[PDB]
């Protein structure tokens, strides 16, 4: 499907990912 | 036809088909809010904290 979209070295960028079976 | 009687005239129609499932609520009603009164004993709600 295609049902959703969203928008929002001396250094590092840090990321974390998790999902509540849909949230 | 533009000459049609009201039963045979076109109407635009929409159903707002709601759902509420295992997937959480992505849609909800409005947060209608009051003026703010200080220095008096009151009940209060801020962002659902009562």
Coordinates of N, CA and C in Angstrom, one line a residue:
Chain A
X1 N 0.8 -1.2 0.0 CA 0.0 0.0 0.0 C 0.9 1.3 0.0
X2 N 0.2 2.5 0.1 CA 0.9 3.8 0.1 C 0.2 4.8 1.0
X3 N -0.3 4.3 2.2 CA -1.3 5.0 2.9 C -0.8 6.1 3.9
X4 N 0.5 6.4 4.0 CA 1.0 7.4 5.0 C 2.3 8.1 4.5
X5 N 2.4 9.4 4.9 CA 3.7 10.1 4.8 C 3.8 11.2 5.9
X6 N 5.0 11.6 6.2 CA 5.3 12.7 7.2 C 6.6 13.4 7.0
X7 N 6.7 14.6 7.5 CA 8.0 15.4 7.4 C 8.2 16.2 8.7
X8 N 9.4 16.3 9.2 CA 9.9 17.0 10.4 C 11.1 17.9 10.1
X9 N 35.0 13.9 11.6 CA 34.0 14.8 12.1 C 34.1 15.0 13.6
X10 N 33.9 16.2 14.1 CA 33.7 16.6 15.5 C 32.3 16.3 16.1
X11 N 31.4 15.9 15.3 CA 30.0 15.6 15.6 C 29.4 14.3 15.1
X12 N 28.4 13.8 15.8 CA 27.6 12.6 15.5 C 26.1 12.9 15.6
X13 N 25.3 12.3 14.8 CA 23.8 12.3 14.9 C 23.3 10.9 15.4
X14 N 22.5 11.0 16.4 CA 22.0 9.8 17.1 C 20.5 9.5 16.8
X15 N 20.1 8.3 16.6 CA 18.8 7.9 16.2 C 18.3 6.6 16.9
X16 N 17.0 6.6 17.3 CA 16.3 5.4 17.8 C 15.0 5.2 17.1
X17 N 14.7 3.9 16.9 CA 13.5 3.5 16.2 C 12.7 2.4 17.0
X18 N 11.4 2.6 17.2 CA 10.5 1.5 17.8 C 9.0 1.7 17.4
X19 N 8.2 0.6 17.4 CA 6.8 0.6 17.0 C 5.9 -0.2 17.9
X20 N 4.8 0.3 18.3 CA 3.7 -0.4 19.0 C 2.7 -1.0 18.0
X21 N 3.1 -2.0 17.3 CA 2.4 -2.8 16.2 C 1.4 -1.9 15.4
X22 N 1.9 -0.7 15.0 CA 1.1 0.3 14.3 C 1.3 1.7 14.7
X23 N 1.7 2.0 16.0 CA 2.0 3.3 16.5 C 3.5 3.5 16.5
Chain B
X1 N -29.3 16.9 -16.7 CA -29.7 18.1 -17.5 C -30.0 19.3 -16.6
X2 N -29.7 20.5 -17.0 CA -30.0 21.7 -16.1 C -31.5 21.9 -15.9
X3 N -32.3 21.5 -16.9 CA -33.8 21.6 -16.8 C -34.4 20.5 -15.9
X4 N -33.7 19.5 -15.4 CA -34.3 18.5 -14.6 C -35.0 19.0 -13.3
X5 N -36.1 18.3 -12.9 CA -36.7 18.5 -11.6 C -35.8 18.0 -10.5
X6 N -36.1 18.6 -9.3 CA -35.1 18.4 -8.1 C -34.8 17.0 -7.7
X7 N -35.6 16.0 -7.9 CA -35.3 14.6 -7.7 C -34.4 14.0 -8.8
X8 N -34.3 14.6 -10.0 CA -33.5 14.2 -11.1 C -32.3 15.1 -11.3
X9 N -32.2 16.2 -10.5 CA -31.0 17.0 -10.4 C -29.8 16.3 -9.7
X10 N -28.6 16.5 -10.1 CA -27.4 16.0 -9.4 C -27.3 16.7 -8.0
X11 N -26.9 15.9 -7.1 CA -26.4 16.3 -5.7 C -25.0 15.6 -5.5
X12 N -24.1 16.4 -5.0 CA -22.8 15.9 -4.4 C -23.1 15.4 -3.0
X13 N -22.6 14.2 -2.8 CA -22.8 13.5 -1.5 C -21.5 12.9 -1.0
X14 N -21.3 13.0 0.3 CA -20.1 12.4 1.0 C -20.6 11.6 2.2
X15 N -20.1 10.4 2.4 CA -20.2 9.6 3.7 C -18.9 9.8 4.4
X16 N -18.8 10.4 5.6 CA -17.7 10.3 6.5 C -17.8 8.9 7.2
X17 N -17.3 7.9 6.6 CA -17.3 6.5 7.1 C -16.2 6.4 8.2
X18 N -16.6 6.4 9.5 CA -15.7 6.3 10.6 C -15.3 4.8 10.8
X19 N -14.3 4.5 11.5 CA -13.9 3.2 12.0 C -13.2 3.3 13.4
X20 N -13.3 2.2 14.2 CA -12.5 2.2 15.5 C -12.1 0.7 15.7
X21 N -10.8 0.4 15.6 CA -10.3 -0.9 15.4 C -9.1 -1.3 16.4
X22 N -8.4 -2.4 16.2 CA -7.2 -2.7 16.9 C -6.1 -1.6 16.7
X23 N -6.0 -1.0 15.5 CA -5.2 0.2 15.3 C -5.8 1.4 16.1
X24 N -4.9 2.2 16.8 CA -5.4 3.3 17.7 C -6.1 4.5 17.0
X25 N -6.8 5.3 17.7 CA -7.6 6.4 17.2 C -6.6 7.5 16.6
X26 N -6.6 7.7 15.3 CA -5.9 8.8 14.7 C -6.7 10.1 14.6
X27 N -8.0 10.0 14.8 CA -9.0 11.2 14.8 C -9.7 11.3 16.1
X28 N -9.9 12.6 16.6 CA -10.6 12.9 17.8 C -11.3 14.3 17.8
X29 N -12.3 14.5 18.6 CA -13.0 15.7 18.8 C -12.2 16.9 19.3
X30 N -12.7 18.1 19.3 CA -12.0 19.4 19.6 C -11.7 19.7 21.1
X31 N -10.6 20.3 21.4 CA -10.2 20.7 22.7 C -10.7 22.1 23.2
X32 N -12.0 22.3 23.2 CA -12.6 23.6 23.6 C -12.2 24.0 25.0
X33 N -11.6 25.2 25.1 CA -10.8 25.7 26.3 C -11.4 27.0 26.8
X34 N -11.3 27.2 28.1 CA -11.8 28.4 28.8 C -10.8 29.5 28.9
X35 N -11.3 30.7 29.3 CA -10.4 31.7 29.9 C -9.7 31.2 31.2
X36 N -8.6 31.8 31.6 CA -7.8 31.4 32.8 C -8.0 32.4 33.9
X37 N -8.4 31.9 35.1 CA -8.6 32.7 36.3 C -7.5 32.2 37.4
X38 N -6.7 33.2 37.8 CA -5.7 33.0 38.8 C -6.2 33.5 40.2
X39 N -5.4 33.2 41.3 CA -5.7 33.6 42.7 C -7.0 33.3 43.3
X40 N -7.8 32.4 42.7 CA -9.1 31.8 43.3 C -9.1 30.3 43.3
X41 N -9.7 29.7 44.3 CA -9.9 28.3 44.4 C -10.8 27.8 43.3
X42 N -10.4 26.9 42.4 CA -11.1 26.4 41.2 C -10.8 24.9 41.0
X43 N -11.6 24.2 40.2 CA -11.2 23.0 39.5 C -10.5 23.4 38.3
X44 N -9.5 22.7 37.8 CA -8.7 22.9 36.6 C -8.4 21.6 35.9
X45 N -8.2 21.8 34.6 CA -7.7 20.8 33.7 C -6.6 21.5 32.8
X46 N -5.4 20.9 32.8 CA -4.4 21.3 31.8 C -3.9 20.1 31.0
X47 N -4.1 20.1 29.7 CA -3.7 18.9 28.8 C -4.2 17.5 29.3
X48 N -5.4 17.5 30.0 CA -6.0 16.3 30.5 C -5.5 15.9 32.0
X49 N -4.6 16.7 32.5 CA -4.3 16.6 34.0 C -5.3 17.4 34.7
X50 N -6.1 16.8 35.5 CA -7.2 17.4 36.4 C -6.7 17.6 37.8

